[PDB]
Amino acid sequence: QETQGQAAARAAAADLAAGQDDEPRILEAPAPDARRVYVNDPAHFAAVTQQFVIDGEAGRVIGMIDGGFLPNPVVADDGSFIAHASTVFSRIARGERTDYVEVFDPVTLLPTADIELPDAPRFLVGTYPWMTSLTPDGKTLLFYQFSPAPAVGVVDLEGKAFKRMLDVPDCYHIFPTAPDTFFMHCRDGSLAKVAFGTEGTPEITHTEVFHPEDEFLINHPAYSQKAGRLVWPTYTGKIHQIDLSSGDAKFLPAVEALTEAERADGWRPGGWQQVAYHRALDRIYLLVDQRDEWRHKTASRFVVVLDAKTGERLAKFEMGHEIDSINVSQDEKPLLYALSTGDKTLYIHDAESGEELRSVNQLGHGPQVITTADMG
Amino acid sequence: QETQGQAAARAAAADLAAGQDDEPRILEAPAPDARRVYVNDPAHFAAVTQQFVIDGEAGRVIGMIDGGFLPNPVVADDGSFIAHASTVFSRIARGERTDYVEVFDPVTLLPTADIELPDAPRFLVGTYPWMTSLTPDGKTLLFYQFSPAPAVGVVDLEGKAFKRMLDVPDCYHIFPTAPDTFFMHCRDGSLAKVAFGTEGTPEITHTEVFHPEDEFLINHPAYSQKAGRLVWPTYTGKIHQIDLSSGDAKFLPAVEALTEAERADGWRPGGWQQVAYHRALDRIYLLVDQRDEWRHKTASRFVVVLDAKTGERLAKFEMGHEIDSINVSQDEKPLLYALSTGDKTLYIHDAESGEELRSVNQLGHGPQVITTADMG
Amino acid sequence: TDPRAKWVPQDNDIQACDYWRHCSIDGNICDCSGGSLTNCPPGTKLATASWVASCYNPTDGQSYLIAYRDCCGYNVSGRCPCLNTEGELPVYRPEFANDIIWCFGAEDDAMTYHCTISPIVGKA
Amino acid sequence: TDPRAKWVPQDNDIQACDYWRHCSIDGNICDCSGGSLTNCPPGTKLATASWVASCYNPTDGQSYLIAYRDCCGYNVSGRCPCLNTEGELPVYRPEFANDIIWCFGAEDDAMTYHCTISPIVGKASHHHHHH
Amino acid sequence: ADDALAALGAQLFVDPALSRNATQSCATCHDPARAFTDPREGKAGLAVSVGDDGQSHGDRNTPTLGYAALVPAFHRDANGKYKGGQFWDGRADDLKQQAGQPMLNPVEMAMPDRAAVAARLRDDPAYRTGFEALFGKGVLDDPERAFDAAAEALAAYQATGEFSPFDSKYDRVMRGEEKFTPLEEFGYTVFITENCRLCHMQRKQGVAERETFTNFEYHNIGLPVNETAREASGLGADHVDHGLLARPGIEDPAQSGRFKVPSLRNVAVTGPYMHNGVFTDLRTAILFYNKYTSRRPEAKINPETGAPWGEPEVARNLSLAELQSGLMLDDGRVDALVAFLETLTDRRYEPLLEE
Amino acid sequence: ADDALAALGAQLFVDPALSRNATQSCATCHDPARAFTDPREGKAGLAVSVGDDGQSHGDRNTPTLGYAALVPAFHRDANGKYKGGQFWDGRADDLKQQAGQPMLNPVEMAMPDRAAVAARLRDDPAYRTGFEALFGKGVLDDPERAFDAAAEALAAYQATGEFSPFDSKYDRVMRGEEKFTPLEEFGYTVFITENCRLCHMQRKQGVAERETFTNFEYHNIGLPVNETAREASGLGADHVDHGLLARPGIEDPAQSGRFKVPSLRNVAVTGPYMHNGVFTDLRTAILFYNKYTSRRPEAKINPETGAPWGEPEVARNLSLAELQSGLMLDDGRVDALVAFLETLTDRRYEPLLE
Ligand code: HEC
Ligand code: HEC
Ligand code: HEC
Ligand code: HEC
Ligand SMILES: [Ca+2]
Ligand SMILES: [Ca+2]
Ligand code: NA
Ligand code: NA
Ligand code: NA
Ligand code: NA
Numbered sequence A, B: 001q002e003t004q005g006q007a008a009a010r011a012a013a014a015d016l017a018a019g020q021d022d023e024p025r026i027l028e029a030p031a032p033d034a035r036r037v038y039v040n041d042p043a044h045f046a047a048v049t050q051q052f053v054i055d056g057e058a059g060r061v062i063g064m065i066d067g068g069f070l071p072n073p074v075v076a077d078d079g080s081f082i083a084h085a086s087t088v089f090s091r092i093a094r095g096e097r098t099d100y101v102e103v104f105d106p107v108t109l110l111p112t113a114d115i116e117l118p119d120a121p122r123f124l125v126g127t128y129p130w131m132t133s134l135t136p137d138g139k140t141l142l143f144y145q146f147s148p149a150p151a152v153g154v155v156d157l158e159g160k161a162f163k164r165m166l167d168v169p170d171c172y173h174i175f176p177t178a179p180d181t182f183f184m185h186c187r188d189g190s191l192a193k194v195a196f197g198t199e200g201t202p203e204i205t206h207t208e209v210f211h212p213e214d215e216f217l218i219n220h221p222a223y224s225q226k227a228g229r230l231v232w233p234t235y236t237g238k239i240h241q242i243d244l245s246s247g248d249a250k251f252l253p254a255v256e257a258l259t260e261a262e263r264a265d266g267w268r269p270g271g272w273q274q275v276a277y278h279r280a281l282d283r284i285y286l287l288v289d290q291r292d293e294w295r296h297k298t299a300s301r302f303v304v305v306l307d308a309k310t311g312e313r314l315a316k317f318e319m320g321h322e323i324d325s326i327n328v329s330q331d332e333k334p335l336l337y338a339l340s341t342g343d344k345t346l347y348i349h350d351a352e353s354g355e356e357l358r359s360v361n362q363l364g365h366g367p368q369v370i371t372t373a374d375m376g
Numbered sequence C: 001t002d003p004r005a006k007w008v009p010q011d012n013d014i015q016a017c018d019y020w021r022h023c024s025i026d027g028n029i030c031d032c033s034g035g036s037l038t039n040c041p042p043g044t045k046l047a048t049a050s051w052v053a054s055c056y057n058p059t060d061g062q063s064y065l066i067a068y069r070d071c072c073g074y075n076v077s078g079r080c081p082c083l084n085t086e087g088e089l090p091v092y093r094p095e096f097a098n099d100i101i102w103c104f105g106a107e108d109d110a111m112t113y114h115c116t117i118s119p120i121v122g123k124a
Numbered sequence D: 001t002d003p004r005a006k007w008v009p010q011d012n013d014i015q016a017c018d019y020w021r022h023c024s025i026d027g028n029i030c031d032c033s034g035g036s037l038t039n040c041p042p043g044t045k046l047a048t049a050s051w052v053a054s055c056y057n058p059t060d061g062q063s064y065l066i067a068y069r070d071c072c073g074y075n076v077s078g079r080c081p082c083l084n085t086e087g088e089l090p091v092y093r094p095e096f097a098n099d100i101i102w103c104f105g106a107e108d109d110a111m112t113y114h115c116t117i118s119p120i121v122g123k124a125s126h127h128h129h130h131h
Numbered sequence E: 001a002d003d004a005l006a007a008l009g010a011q012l013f014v015d016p017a018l019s020r021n022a023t024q025s026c027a028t029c030h031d032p033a034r035a036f037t038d039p040r041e042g043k044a045g046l047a048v049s050v051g052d053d054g055q056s057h058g059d060r061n062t063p064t065l066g067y068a069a070l071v072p073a074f075h076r077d078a079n080g081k082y083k084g085g086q087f088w089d090g091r092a093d094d095l096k097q098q099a100g101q102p103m104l105n106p107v108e109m110a111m112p113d114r115a116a117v118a119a120r121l122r123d124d125p126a127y128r129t130g131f132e133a134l135f136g137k138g139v140l141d142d143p144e145r146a147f148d149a150a151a152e153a154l155a156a157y158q159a160t161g162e163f164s165p166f167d168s169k170y171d172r173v174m175r176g177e178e179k180f181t182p183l184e185e186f187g188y189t190v191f192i193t194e195n196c197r198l199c200h201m202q203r204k205q206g207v208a209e210r211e212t213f214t215n216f217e218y219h220n221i222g223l224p225v226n227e228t229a230r231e232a233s234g235l236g237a238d239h240v241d242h243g244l245l246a247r248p249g250i251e252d253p254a255q256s257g258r259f260k261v262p263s264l265r266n267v268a269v270t271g272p273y274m275h276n277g278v279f280t281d282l283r284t285a286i287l288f289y290n291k292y293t294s295r296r297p298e299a300k301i302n303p304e305t306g307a308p309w310g311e312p313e314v315a316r317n318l319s320l321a322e323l324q325s326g327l328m329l330d331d332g333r334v335d336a337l338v339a340f341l342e343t344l345t346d347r348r349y350e351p352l353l354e355e
Numbered sequence F: 001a002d003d004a005l006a007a008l009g010a011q012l013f014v015d016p017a018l019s020r021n022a023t024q025s026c027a028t029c030h031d032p033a034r035a036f037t038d039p040r041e042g043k044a045g046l047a048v049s050v051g052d053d054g055q056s057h058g059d060r061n062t063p064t065l066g067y068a069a070l071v072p073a074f075h076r077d078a079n080g081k082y083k084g085g086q087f088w089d090g091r092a093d094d095l096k097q098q099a100g101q102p103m104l105n106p107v108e109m110a111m112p113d114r115a116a117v118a119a120r121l122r123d124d125p126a127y128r129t130g131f132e133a134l135f136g137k138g139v140l141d142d143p144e145r146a147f148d149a150a151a152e153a154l155a156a157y158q159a160t161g162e163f164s165p166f167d168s169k170y171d172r173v174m175r176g177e178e179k180f181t182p183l184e185e186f187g188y189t190v191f192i193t194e195n196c197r198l199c200h201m202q203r204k205q206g207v208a209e210r211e212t213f214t215n216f217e218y219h220n221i222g223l224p225v226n227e228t229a230r231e232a233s234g235l236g237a238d239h240v241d242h243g244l245l246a247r248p249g250i251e252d253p254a255q256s257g258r259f260k261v262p263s264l265r266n267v268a269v270t271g272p273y274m275h276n277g278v279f280t281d282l283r284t285a286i287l288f289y290n291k292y293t294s295r296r297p298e299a300k301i302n303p304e305t306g307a308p309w310g311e312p313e314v315a316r317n318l319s320l321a322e323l324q325s326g327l328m329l330d331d332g333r334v335d336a337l338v339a340f341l342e343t344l345t346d347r348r349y350e351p352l353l354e
Helices: A004-018 A260-264 B004-018 B260-264 E002-013 E095-104 E114-122 E125-135 E143-158 E169-174 E182-193 E227-233 E282-290 E331-342 E347-353 F002-013 F095-104 F114-122 F125-135 F143-158 F169-174 F182-193 F227-233 F282-292 F331-342 F347-353
Strands: A036-041 A049-055 A060-067 A072-075 A082-091 A094-104 A111-117 A132-134 A140-145 A151-156 A161-167 A171-178 A181-186 A191-195 A203-206 A222-224 A229-233 A238-243 A250-256 A267-269 A275-278 A283-290 A300-307 A313-323 A325-328 A335-340 A345-350 A356-360 A369-371 B036-041 B049-055 B060-067 B072-075 B082-091 B094-104 B111-117 B132-134 B140-145 B151-156 B161-167 B171-178 B181-186 B191-195 B203-206 B222-224 B229-233 B238-243 B267-269 B275-278 B283-290 B300-307 B313-323 B325-328 B335-340 B345-350 B356-360 B369-371 C026-028 C051-057 C062-072 C081-083 C113-117 C120-123 D026-028 D051-056 D063-072 D081-083 D113-117 D120-123
Touching (some): A060 A082, A072 A132, A132 A171, A222 A275, A229 A275, A275 A325, A313 A345, A335 A369, B060 B082, B082 B140, B111 B161, B229 B275, B260 B267, B275 B325, B283 B325, B313 B335, B313 B345, B325 B369, C026 C113, C051 E182, C062 E182, D063 F182, E002 E125, E114 E143, E125 E143, E282 E331, F002 F125, F002 F143, F095 F114, F095 F143, F125 F143
Antiparallel strands (some): A049 A060, A082 A094, A094 A111, A140 A151, A151 A161, A171 A181, A222 A229, A283 A300, A300 A313, A335 A345, B036 B369, B049 B060, B072 B082, B082 B094, B151 B161, B171 B181, B191 B203, B229 B238, B267 B283, B300 B313, B325 B335, B345 B356, D063 D113
16 A cells, blocks of 8 residues: 555665665666566657566566667567667668667666668568567567568577578568467468578468458457467457467367457457467457447457357456556466556556556556566 | 638648649748747657747748757758757667757758767757857857866858867856857856857956856846847846847846845746847846746746836736746747747747737647747 | 547548548648648658548548558657548558558658658549 | 645655655656666666755755766656756756756766666755755 | 541541551551550561551550540640650640651651642542531642641541540449459559559549549650660661650750650550560569569569560669659569559450450 | 773874884874874975885875774675775774784884884883783783784774864864855865765765765776885885785785775875875865866876876776766866865864965
């Protein structure tokens, strides 16, 4: 019930009364752990941006990382590093463009690598987590390029060097399954498996087509790399699941997040990061609300929780705020993270009861993306 | 009563209905005139900032210019160009620092010069207009340096090159009075005249001390280069006026913007740009309110207007908003500009009646500085 | 004002988020930073690529193809932000996707987003 | 909330703009971006330069010298902004002036402003500003 | 009278008597069975047409006459863009000024002079009656009046519905009578979102009444010489076709290498393509644009030859602003654009798409 | 008792029988009339002191003993910084371990050994009484016990109020008995806002109970050799004073050239300045720091000589983070710092201030 500012006033007054000395210095963040969460603020397309590093258990900002124009954040699942792909210009938002990847130490937040990406190759888009992706060994970062045509850049994080671009078909997003392989989603309704080397045409194999041309699959699917589970909602809350854990795509039965009566009464998912997935519990969380069909990027005030195997609904939480984005911590008794772009506030909820526990406000100008590590 | 957005909907619908074609293109801003006004947003110390170019007559944003960290804007009085001294870093707010001057065409807003300033020499401070100043011929830009000591940098706008730093005494601000001369205000209470050649120690002469040690002169005096009139309020609203038009300082009789009875009742100036000066009318405008003596940077809700020659009060306006900065157009029937940092809004008033005519909102994150050209 | 309600176009004010041609705009209306409905502000660069939507015009009962264009090479204007997504499809149907910074082709390789213009290019 | 009223210090919450040591802060409180009352957040650089104010502590009735320090090399935090000006003097008395970015002496020549810390260095009163 | 002028033009259009050796009419090179273009094979394939002497080749590809009546008369607009006119270089102001040129051209119909053309008209009792009814008695006795009247009649016939029927699948879809396939609709969406519509739509904005997929402007898209056509024409290895600059009265060197944007209507059936017939296939004409946008090696190679596209005949004044669009056309989008451009084919030429 | 032990130390302190030829006592070099420093002019001015033999000069300047009792025993703190001890290089752990060293140093009091010291102690009936009362019968017959006891009394005498009275103007102002002048107050504010307080203040934050204007750490501020003092010391032109690295048991190369931060109390009356007495005027010692900050050509010049300050004697481990502060002291700030430092003069030395 005592706030963090009140606790600190008490502590500082006791040190003053006791005559305690301490040296002003640069703090280290606490060690990365399951309840650390990162919030990125694309700032409604501003030329510079910010990421907030947060202790979810305390509801406290423990660090920040500056970024350039629409950067893509990634967080190693084991907690060993974080990194982003970013873009800057010689005079704020014009002149010469430099695209680069920086890797950071997760406790000092100092850059430990700054790697230039030649010929300005990043795709500049409102932030989609799976447009830049670590392989599961953490040694390689893969990023999407849209112009002049779809391609995938390969960055060697261990050797701190850009490696190559790969040409790909008309496909989007990058879900890595092995040191040398990832999947993309194709315009034709298939996934493409891409297996690449340092040089040479990559081996690209399409899966079966798995959805019709008029089912629209959102820009923010959840992907659990450690489970190889791709959880892909459509505009109506139908959920496609793809099991990539064998190294090939296996199509799981589709589930409906909303009932037929709810859909008839206008319930649809909506927001930005509309879906989360908890690996250990095998559970799916989806941001939903009553809305017109083309209001699919507006906030939502409800989260439905369902069993990924059977599709059975476990809960429907009333969030009590306008929520654009959700994610969960990957530990036992996980937290449900609920970010409001409009309130610039992260609301931290108990993922089992749905109760709001605490919140962190003043998170930049238009915070949109929540990332956690799967450390377990 | 028809808004600009309404008039523009009607014109667009008529073009459509008539089949009038028009080519999408980059517009030119209207010619600079007496009623153009520039609003600088330092954005509460953000690493990147914006300037808004506004037509004060229509109450319309006619253009923008991007800047770096705490830039200093200047506007040529004859309307031929605008410029700023700005500061960028190679990784947003960290890495190699570059300070530079850009000069812009006032109708295309395109940079016509980009002049690097060696060894990152700018003084980084909350924005004071007279910390970066043009000479009256418009051919030289002078900027203040605080570290390692007070100094003034000379930038040749005609040859597009930094020239040199001038060593000065313990003095602040820069009021140019000729192609080769400017005045500064010294810690000891005198003004210093600095006369500078193409080479040498400058010739530096002091006036006698014109204010005592316990009389505090604000960071934002009004200076009319065309009048050679420096108008410098103290924290109590006592107004020092210095005539620089003969090329030497002559100190005018001090005037009090507030009466003794008002001062006893807590009236004091307060805000950022607290004082404006209209040359043709020889009139002084001062933002004031009832305030504790150490709330001198808070908004004020009143403007007092007084005759600069006699010190008689001509008017006292209730502004009707929390105002931080004022300035006026330099034409007849001048506008009084009243900028609210908190509202991010420029309120545009008739300077004679004090009545609000129109406003321009959404001006950045914490806009603070108004600049007008004196084109008469 | 209910953000989840069906969007209702008007043809009376171009600076409002419900103006009919802004049915799939994502960003800022150029008219509010010194451009006009179909012209960029001074100092920006006009992209040559576009994004399309079919926008109903309540003035004449007709749907028109709006081929939006970004004005680029400036930090985001911050004035008259709007986000509408009528007909808007995911990134793999990019001709209708509006999170992409469509600054491709702008002079001087400009790729930062300032604001968007809303010119008509045909009937639906 | 009257912004023009005499400022009233408290000793119960360091994240609030009326906390007693913040009597001449200008920027953002470091404790709100991963620092603490007297420490910089990770990744930032602590300046050696400082600004002073005599800040009255309502708890013990003494006035302390707070020699503020900037944490530099990051964009402004945006969390817990505050501007107080108790005893604050114009730029030509720079020891007491708070619009200056006091990032001098920061490692790596960091000069951008992120947030400010509020340590005590001593007791005392100033001629221009004594309780 | 409107009918009568155009019916007189109909007879002239197919009359070989307007050629020196009486072997060639307008319809020889502008064959109505081929969307008013030339099916005959010459020394350069179909790239250029053979004249009435059976030997002389032109140096430009014979364009369709379909929809040519929608083009404005030649003028400089307020932005200083030239627009409108006839021939690939706009050197004729309008259809009437163009009509007499093939007749007197020694590499086409090759009549010696106006008097010889009038003497041919006079020989024919049907022309005496038809001309005199519209233009007055004695018209065929005055070479200048007779030549001017014949051009008038020809221009009037090309302004009829027969030349500009607006019955392509595209027109039917726009009238709500049918729907595009997903592939056609995709190609339409590509056409409008990529750079194509910056030159191949009538208007910069708003809605055209009678779209013909050209803005009537002059652009240099940087095409190479067609070597076999240029050898056939006999103009010489050192010749340069300066496009618009060659129009008498244009002196602006910025107009060098600029050619009038063709209407894309019937493009599917009027190969080969560009002002010199340099590309055989419609796909190749589309892939040419990727040379400005793609970095792939394939983008620099003409798929018909396996060789580089070639150095521009005029390597200055390229429309780089429009051409350097930042986005290349992948194969699925080239497929879509071919499908869409096939929808611009008039109904009566749909049978031609098979081949 | 503690009183008695110090009273014994008071006797020893002024006793020249502790020197080989009986020509000098502690008080000779640490003169109480000069804040316990050496007024005598030798071959290098007042830079270094002459020993009992009348010819030998040291290589370092004699420090004040005022306030030396506030320095903690030598140790290495949790951040790996050495702090405390005695001598400019910290080679003695505390005042007790220091006191015996001038006695036996051939360039100072020059006694041949502890036994010679004991013998001189035994010769004095007042010492037999005084030492025996505190340490037990026969103390003076045992050279080790005698010498160790003499050092204990001397350390006790130095820890009395007479060495550390806290009666300077600065002290009176902090007790609220009087006010700084405007210049002195400016000077104090300069000292706190500029780099000086990074090294010359007991604590990092909070309020010190008995401030002595040092943090007790070791720094290399890049001082040049004092040429005439080095010549007078006889250590040779090839000698390098390695400061703290010279303490036995210190091996870490990063301590080379570092010296103990001196207390600034009575600084106005204890010139010349620095470990080697190189600067005679307090204003010159202050101006020295401008060499790391100012870009004016005069910053490179020692005003006392009109020539460049000179290369550092040890050109590594300079405390650049603290020294390169980005801010020059202009003349007005240098005047204000002098005025402030003069307020740190003990009450009994205020008459020396002129
Ligand atoms: C082959 C020997 C031809 C005969 C017989 C005629 N035309 Fe033609 N036509 C020909 C070429 C090679 C060209 C382009 C030449 C160039 O310099 O650009 C043309 C062009 C026209 C045009 C212009 C169409 C456009 O620019 O879009 C028109 C209106 C035209 N031709 C009409 C026309 C008439 C009426 C004819 C009989 C009098 C005639 N042409 C004969 C090839 C040949
Ligand atoms: C202006 C800069 C243009 C853009 C952008 C595109 N086109 Fe174009 N096209 C243009 C010109 C000036 C010409 C004639 C060039 C010459 O000198 O011959 C063309 C020609 C075509 C053709 C051939 C038509 C014919 O020969 O009758 C086709 C099929 C064509 N253009 C298609 C096309 C497409 C699909 C585009 C977007 C990729 C495109 N053009 C862009 C002018 C310009
Ligand atoms: C001149 C010949 C001296 C006599 C006699 C004594 N001292 Fe001294 N003292 C002298 C010097 C040159 C130095 C510094 C030498 C060095 O290597 O650093 C000292 C130092 C001390 C200190 C240390 C103070 C400090 O580091 O701040 C103490 C406590 C001290 N001296 C005490 C002392 C006593 C008790 C003496 C009589 C036995 C004595 N000194 C004699 C110069 C000379
Ligand atoms: C740590 C890096 C320091 C900073 C910053 C300042 N001083 Fe200092 N001071 C320091 C040391 C380690 C020493 C002795 C150096 C040596 O080897 O001899 C000093 C010395 C002084 C002196 C001379 C005192 C005396 O000899 O008794 C004075 C007057 C002095 N220092 C003052 C001073 C001022 C005013 C400063 C801010 C401008 C300052 N110092 C900075 C350690 C450090
Ligand atoms: Ca053709
Ligand atoms: Ca000394
Ligand atoms: Na050929
Ligand atoms: Na010509
Ligand atoms: Na000397
Ligand atoms: Na040693």
